Amino acid sequence: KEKINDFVRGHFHGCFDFDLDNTLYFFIAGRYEYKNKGADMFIEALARLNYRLKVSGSKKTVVAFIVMPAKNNSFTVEALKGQAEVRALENTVHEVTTSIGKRIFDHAIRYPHNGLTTELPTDLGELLKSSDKVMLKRRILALRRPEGQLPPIVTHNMVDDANDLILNKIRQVQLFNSPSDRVKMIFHPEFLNANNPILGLDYDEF
Amino acid sequence: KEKINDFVRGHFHGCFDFDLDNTLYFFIAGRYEYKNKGADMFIEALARLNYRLKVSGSKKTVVAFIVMPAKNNSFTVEALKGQAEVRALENTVHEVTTSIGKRIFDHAIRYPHNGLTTELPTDLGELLKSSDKVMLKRRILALRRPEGQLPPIVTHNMVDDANDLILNKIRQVQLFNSPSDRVKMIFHPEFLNANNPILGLDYDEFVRGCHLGVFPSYYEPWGYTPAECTVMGVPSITTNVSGFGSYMEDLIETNQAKDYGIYIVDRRFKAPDESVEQLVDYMEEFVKKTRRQRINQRNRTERLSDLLD
Amino acid sequence: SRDLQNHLLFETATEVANRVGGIYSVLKSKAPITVAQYKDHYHLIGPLNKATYQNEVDILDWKKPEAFSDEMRPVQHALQTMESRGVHFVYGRWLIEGAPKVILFDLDSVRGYSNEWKGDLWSLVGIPSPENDFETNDAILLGYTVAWFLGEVAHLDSQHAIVAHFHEWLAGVALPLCRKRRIDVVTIFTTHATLLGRYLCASGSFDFYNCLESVDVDHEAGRFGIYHRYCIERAAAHSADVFTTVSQITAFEAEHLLKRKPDGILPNGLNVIKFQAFHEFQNLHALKKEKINDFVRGHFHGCFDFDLDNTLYFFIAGRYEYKNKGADMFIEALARLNYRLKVSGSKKTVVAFIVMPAKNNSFTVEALKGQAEVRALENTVHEVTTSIGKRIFDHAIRYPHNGLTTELPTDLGELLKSSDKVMLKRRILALRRPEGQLPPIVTHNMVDDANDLILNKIRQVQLFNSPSDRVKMIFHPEFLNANNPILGLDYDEFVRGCHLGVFPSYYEPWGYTPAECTVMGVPSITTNVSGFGSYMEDLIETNQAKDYGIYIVDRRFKAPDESVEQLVDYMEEFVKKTRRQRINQRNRTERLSDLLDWKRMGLEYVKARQLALRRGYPDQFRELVGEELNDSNMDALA
Ligand SMILES: O=c1ccn([C@@H]2O[C@H](COP(=O)(O)OP(=O)(O)O[C@H]3OC[C@@H](O)[C@H](O)[C@H]3O)[C@@H](O)[C@H]2O)c(=O)[nH]1
Ligand SMILES: O=c1ccn([C@@H]2O[C@H](COP(=O)(O)OP(=O)(O)O[C@H]3OC[C@@H](O)[C@H](O)[C@H]3O)[C@@H](O)[C@H]2O)c(=O)[nH]1
Ligand SMILES: O=c1ccn([C@@H]2O[C@H](COP(=O)(O)OP(=O)(O)O)[C@@H](O)[C@H]2O)c(=O)[nH]1
Numbered sequence A: 001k002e003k004i005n006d007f008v009r010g011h012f013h014g015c016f017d018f019d020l021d022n023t024l025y026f027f028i029a030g031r032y033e034y035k036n037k038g039a040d041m042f043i044e045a046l047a048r049l050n051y052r053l054k055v056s057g058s059k060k061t062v063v064a065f066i067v068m069p070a071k072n073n074s075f076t077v078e079a080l081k082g083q084a085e086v087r088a089l090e091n092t093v094h095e096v097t098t099s100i101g102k103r104i105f106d107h108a109i110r111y112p113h114n115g116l117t118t119e120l121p122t123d124l125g126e127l128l129k130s131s132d133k134v135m136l137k138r139r140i141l142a143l144r145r146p147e148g149q150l151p152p153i154v155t156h157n158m159v160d161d162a163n164d165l166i167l168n169k170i171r172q173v174q175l176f177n178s179p180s181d182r183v184k185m186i187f188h189p190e191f192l193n194a195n196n197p198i199l200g201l202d203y204d205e206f
Numbered sequence B: 001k002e003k004i005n006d007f008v009r010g011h012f013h014g015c016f017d018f019d020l021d022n023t024l025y026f027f028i029a030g031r032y033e034y035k036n037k038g039a040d041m042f043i044e045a046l047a048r049l050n051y052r053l054k055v056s057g058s059k060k061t062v063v064a065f066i067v068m069p070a071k072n073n074s075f076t077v078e079a080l081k082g083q084a085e086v087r088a089l090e091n092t093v094h095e096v097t098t099s100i101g102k103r104i105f106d107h108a109i110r111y112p113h114n115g116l117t118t119e120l121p122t123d124l125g126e127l128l129k130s131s132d133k134v135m136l137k138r139r140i141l142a143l144r145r146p147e148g149q150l151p152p153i154v155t156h157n158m159v160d161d162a163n164d165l166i167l168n169k170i171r172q173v174q175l176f177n178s179p180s181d182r183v184k185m186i187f188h189p190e191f192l193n194a195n196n197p198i199l200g201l202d203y204d205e206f207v208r209g210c211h212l213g214v215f216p217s218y219y220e221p222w223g224y225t226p227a228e229c230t231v232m233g234v235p236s237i238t239t240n241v242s243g244f245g246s247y248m249e250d251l252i253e254t255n256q257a258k259d260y261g262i263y264i265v266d267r268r269f270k271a272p273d274e275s276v277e278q279l280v281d282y283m284e285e286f287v288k289k290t291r292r293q294r295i296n297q298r299n300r301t302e303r304l305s306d307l308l309d
Numbered sequence C: 001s002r003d004l005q006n007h008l009l010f011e012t013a014t015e016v017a018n019r020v021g022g023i024y025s026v027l028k029s030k031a032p033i034t035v036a037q038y039k040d041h042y043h044l045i046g047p048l049n050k051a052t053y054q055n056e057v058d059i060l061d062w063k064k065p066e067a068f069s070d071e072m073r074p075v076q077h078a079l080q081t082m083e084s085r086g087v088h089f090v091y092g093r094w095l096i097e098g099a100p101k102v103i104l105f106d107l108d109s110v111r112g113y114s115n116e117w118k119g120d121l122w123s124l125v126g127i128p129s130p131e132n133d134f135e136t137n138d139a140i141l142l143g144y145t146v147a148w149f150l151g152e153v154a155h156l157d158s159q160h161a162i163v164a165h166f167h168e169w170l171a172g173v174a175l176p177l178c179r180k181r182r183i184d185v186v187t188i189f190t191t192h193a194t195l196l197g198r199y200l201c202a203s204g205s206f207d208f209y210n211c212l213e214s215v216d217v218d219h220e221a222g223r224f225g226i227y228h229r230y231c232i233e234r235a236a237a238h239s240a241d242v243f244t245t246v247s248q249i250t251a252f253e254a255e256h257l258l259k260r261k262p263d264g265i266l267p268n269g270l271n272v273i274k275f276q277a278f279h280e281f282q283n284l285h286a287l288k289k290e291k292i293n294d295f296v297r298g299h300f301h302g303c304f305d306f307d308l309d310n311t312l313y314f315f316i317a318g319r320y321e322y323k324n325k326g327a328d329m330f331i332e333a334l335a336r337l338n339y340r341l342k343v344s345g346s347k348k349t350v351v352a353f354i355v356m357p358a359k360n361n362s363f364t365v366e367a368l369k370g371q372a373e374v375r376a377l378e379n380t381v382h383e384v385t386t387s388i389g390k391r392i393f394d395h396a397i398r399y400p401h402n403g404l405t406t407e408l409p410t411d412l413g414e415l416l417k418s419s420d421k422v423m424l425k426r427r428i429l430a431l432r433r434p435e436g437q438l439p440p441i442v443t444h445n446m447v448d449d450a451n452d453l454i455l456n457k458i459r460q461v462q463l464f465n466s467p468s469d470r471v472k473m474i475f476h477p478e479f480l481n482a483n484n485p486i487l488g489l490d491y492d493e494f495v496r497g498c499h500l501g502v503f504p505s506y507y508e509p510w511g512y513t514p515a516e517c518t519v520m521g522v523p524s525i526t527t528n529v530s531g532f533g534s535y536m537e538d539l540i541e542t543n544q545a546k547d548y549g550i551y552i553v554d555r556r557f558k559a560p561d562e563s564v565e566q567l568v569d570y571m572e573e574f575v576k577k578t579r580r581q582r583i584n585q586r587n588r589t590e591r592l593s594d595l596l597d598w599k600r601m602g603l604e605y606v607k608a609r610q611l612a613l614r615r616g617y618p619d620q621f622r623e624l625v626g627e628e629l630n631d632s633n634m635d636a637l638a
């Protein structure tokens, strides 16, 4: 689940307004048979669940995955780029905490000498410097997305987007991952595999 | 030097009141020959250097190492315990920063939603929770040493502590590692080796880490100690009665030799007390150096390498 | 009557709180050394940018008696006199190192007088001024407003000499006004290019450095629709007591196109930030280079058959000006270098970067994918090595018991298990490229790929990153930025990671690029028609210059084919160097950086301001020095 979360943060970069500790992950998977496998019921029912959760004031969130192979030209630029930006934020955070660590350590080992009246740091300015702030802010800016852009409903570039049954149904029921939607749609038109660059999981692990 | 820093933090646990970024590391090394190798002049000059630095209001700290093997019963429980206590604080700090990291990250990734109005956290309490504060406080308490107890002048239990020359000399000059002393003394009565549990360095590594070797020998036909030291780009003090000292005194004009990090104390044509004062003038001169000037000197020292090959 | 040692400085430009071009960087980086000399006697003057001045200017009140000293009172009363007519302005500190005082004039508050001043300017100096040209209109409004102000300061300050320095034709209109009105202020004009220069080199077909001396300036300025602008630049050049350019090469073109031999050179310095330890720049180079390496492994995934420990990084960077920045020579020369390195049987590899912005639709799927696949291998290796460690450790802690005859494991099978292998093999399969596909020559999807000059030239010379090519090409058609997902470096970081800048410019009055590259301790190729190259040419004997990392191509006195060959010679000369030779060369290059610092270059601004005082007040200058010093040049004087 922590690997799915890592994917989900990337996918919702700039539009990340729910708690993953209060998020559930539904999925349908299999061979692309829109009728026989019930992708039509699945998507309809999700749209109806979305309504029910908004009406009922639920604070929970459902990210629903559809994993059915369709004809595609691989991952989108957006997918990869969002995964990279989150990864850059992680590394910049890891740098900053290594520095915070050295400053916490110094305070701790030095107490109670050189005017250190408290056992631990009390003011964040002792630990977080200008330099640290600047680069964390730049990482946040990179995650920002254009005014009014929403998280996509599909991770790949489709060969025939306009005629795809799954995507036509998701458009028809209007599940566009808006902030007020309690149910989110992610179509991943390909079998899962740990070699994937965005959701690096074998099917059984997912 | 950072490895020396790690040891020093342990050795001074609970009495750590100086900046290691403004701390210099002097050392004498060799075999236990109190007179011949000049341990007596070293300890004496350091005691006077301490006085000069307190009088001049110097913000520098010198930590003096003595590395000479004596008969011992291995490391003190205190020396080993202190090291384990610092190591335990480091691991707790690392646990805590991992948590802080997840909190910064969450904030950064979520901004500006869910009422996160600033790009970053502004209040420490968002990042540092009470459970973190508790385990840090326990590690700090464990580093605490009893009221009045000072950092030791020695790292090992000595066989016949009372009659040891180095220790009696340290006691006599009263360099007990007080907070007010700008010179600190650490006697390590064993040869250095990487398998050492408290100072896990080979001798060559430890020498590289220091700032100044101090080898005021009376009888030293050669003196491999300042030569090794010089080959590693570490400035050294020696004497004009040592082979190395006279051999270098010959090769460089004696006042220029300072600029190459070869300090030569006159033990031939001066009374012992004029010599001690000279050794102290050198130590004081070196302490007054900035970092940039230390870096330039070490370069010049290192340039001599070839001449000792 | 008037003091020449204690004197005022008014430095006027379009860009003073206001990022437009490179002049902003010059005046900003120069402020520290200027403020150190003048303190509260110095003022920068410019037009107020109402939209953006809030973020740069510390707005300071000018009415209080604590704003100015007793001797600097006249400037207060002069600003008051401007306020007496309703000329609205902003006094303040420019929020930059040095904290210099600025006077920003709101142009909207004199736009009524447009028609009067345009007419005055027409009959005085002959300068026409179309209404659709919004920038000359503003240049005119600025010039009259500033000459007015300097006229009032001259009236009210009878202690100090006044020096008025102007940068670029846009801030030049005040100069003919100061001359004709005979205002008691000595004037300097610095041009950072010429209008006819830029425009005559725009097509990339005109033989500029040879046909320059035979151009009918009025004719060409009419041909390019810039006659009115040309006259402003020309009037500013002629009216100024001292006339300056930023380089010897630009002084050549200035003399024939502006019809006045400049009185000397004002090359652009930097504010070089030193490191405590001289060698730290070497450390940084290795850290930044490791990030370039990381990018390259991804870029060449599946086709990685060379040693990065024996690879060099060349780059060009700048505005996309194919011909004027010599991206054409660069690519041509590299295709020739590639041939020489194959013939000689060198195992080395050059990876050449082109960093020049072109219209694009961001990174390619491929670029991002290979970076992620390499990253996935890294993580899988890290898991495996963690396992390996558990197995080594157990053996180490357990020896010599339970039949362990050797201190360490000896068979790889003891450490690397079936599941470890399967993982690693799968990561390797993800890095596999399709049969025949070569690493690309560009990292982005281009808006007009088929018609791009850079890509067409790479395709023409056929540098397609095949295994047998010793030179690789990577076009990165966007400015570098640490936020970039594939090469997360800022420009300065990337430059430090590289081995050689290559900037074979044709039109380049200064050459900020090779100067900045020099300051990072990275050697570079420039040209003798670049202002940086012409400056280094005269400062160092050109065979010694190579030992300092400054290679200088002759594009003035050689045919283009001879220039290309020389460019190949230098590139090749550099590849031959060992690591130890590269390190010593960078040390030499870094040592040379002190010369590009404003502490040294700002003396030339002093020499220009001296000459202005010596020329405007010769009788007083003679008697405040030992004797009559010569005034034909800045050099001749000092
Ligand atoms: O921790 C340490 C400290 C020092 N050393 C080594 O100890 C050596 C210095 O030892 P000593 O003090 O015995 O001085 P020296 O060995 O140079 O000569 C002295 O003792 C031996 C005799 O050959 C000489 O006549 C005498 O002057 C150096 O080679 C140094 O590398 C270690 O191996 N580990
Ligand atoms: O990725 C990059 C590449 C380059 N740069 C910056 O862009 C500059 C290079 O572009 P510029 O065109 O501004 O500088 P150039 O040396 O190419 O000068 C050119 O343009 C400005 C004019 O004043 C000069 O006369 C002209 O020759 C460098 O100084 C560098 O700091 C980046 O910030 N990021
Ligand atoms: O990303 C995926 C998704 C599904 N499957 C497998 O595909 C098989 C066949 O799916 P299908 O819907 O065709 O099942 P069937 O119609 O046979 O019930 C299942 O056993 C799944 O384990 C897979 O290997 N990777």
Ligand SMILES: O=P(O)(O)OC[C@H]1O[C@H](O)[C@H](O)[C@@H](O)[C@@H]1O
Binding pocket: C282, C283, C285, C286, C289, C499, C579, C582, C583
């Ligand atoms: O990138 P190169 O020219 O091979 O330089 C490589 C060298 O760079 C710096 O000097 C580093 O300090 C050296 O450790 C490194 O070996």
